[PDB]
């Protein structure tokens, strides 16, 4: 059972802007996704302070970076609070309608694309490098779901039947054919050290066979 939804008009505009605007500093996508994971890990930690039973689905608060050259995917896994089905349909837990407005206003008022995270819509920077994005998420209060979109104005949501996650979010980036540099160990390391050296959770960069 696959449900197809249409993006809000403002969100579809944001995605086509990111896809079509000539902009060479694409590496900032990893900083935004890692920052989104750190925000989700902060949320589960804060709720765990007043209720330790919320960590029953997983006590480790970490971030893993998993490149795969065979599938040409870069996956960002975190054990954060996760997202419900309502969260997924509601623009992946963001206030994307108002955040897109302030972002597009700034883009004509001097700002550039690298400042996308300052308006809460940093997740969509994934389409700077990915032709398709798959999001697997598991919140304590809901089941495991799979969000997917190749842009084009629509996305799909389905119950995920694959490997159970416990709790957290998995962002799979199906990279464009000319963006395979972000599958290289030294390139990923350089970006993490440059843009995410002070993240308060362990970041493990997986290596390949
Ligand atoms: O990619 C990276 N992960 C890391 C974790 C710890 C650290 F000190 C550096 C790095 C990287 O560059």
Swiss-Prot record:
Segments passing through the bilayer: none
Residues with N6-acetyllysine modification: 43, 69
Location(s) in or outside the cell: Nucleus; Cytoplasm; Melanosome; Cell membrane
Region (Interaction with NR3C1): 1-209
Superkingdom to which the source organism belongs: Eukaryota
Domain notes: The TPR repeat-binding motif mediates interaction with TPR repeat-containing proteins like the co-chaperone STUB1.
Family: Belongs to the heat shock protein 90 family.
Subunit structure: Homodimer. Identified in NR3C1/GCR steroid receptor-chaperone complexes formed at least by NR3C1, HSP90AA1 and a variety of proteins containing TPR repeats such as FKBP4, FKBP5, PPID, PPP5C or STIP1. Forms a complex containing HSP90AA1, TSC1 and TSC2; TSC1 is required to recruit TCS2 to the complex. The closed form interacts (via the middle domain and TPR repeat-binding motif) with co-chaperone TSC1 (via C-terminus). Interacts with TOM34. Interacts with TERT; the interaction, together with PTGES3, is required for correct assembly and stabilization of the TERT holoenzyme complex. (Microbial infection) Interacts with herpes simplex virus 1 protein US11; this interaction inhibits TBK1-induced interferon production.
Protein name: Heat shock protein HSP 90-alpha
Lineage: Eukaryota, Metazoa, Chordata, Craniata, Vertebrata
Gene: HSP90AA1
């Amino acid at each position: 059972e696959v449900e197809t939804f249409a993006f809000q008009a403002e969100i579809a505009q944001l995605m086509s802007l990111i896809i079509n605007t000539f902009y060479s500093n694409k590496e900032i996508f990893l900083r935004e996704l890692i920052s989104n994971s750190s925000d989700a890990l902060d949320k589960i930690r804060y709720e765990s302070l007043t209720d330790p039973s919320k960590l029953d689905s997983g006590k480790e608060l970490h971030i893993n970076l998993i490149p795969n050259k065979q599938d040409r995917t870069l996956t960002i896994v975190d054990t954060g609070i996760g997202m419900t089905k309502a969260d997924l349909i509601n623009n992946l837990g963001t206030i994307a309608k108002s955040g897109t407005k302030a972002f597009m206003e700034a883009l004509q008022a001097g700002a550039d694309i690298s400042m996308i995270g300052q308006f809460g819509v940093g997740f969509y920077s994934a389409y700077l490098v990915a032709e398709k994005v798959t999001v697997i998420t598991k919140h304590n209060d809901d089941e495991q779901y799979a969000w997917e979109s190749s842009a084009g104005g629509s996305f799909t949501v389905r119950t995920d039947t694959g490997e159970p996650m416990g709790r957290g979010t998995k962002v799979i980036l199906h990279l464009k054919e000319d963006q395979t540099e972000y599958l290289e160990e030294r390139r990923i390391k350089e970006i993490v050290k440059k843009h995410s050296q002070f993240i308060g959770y362990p970041i493990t960069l997986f290596v390949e066979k």
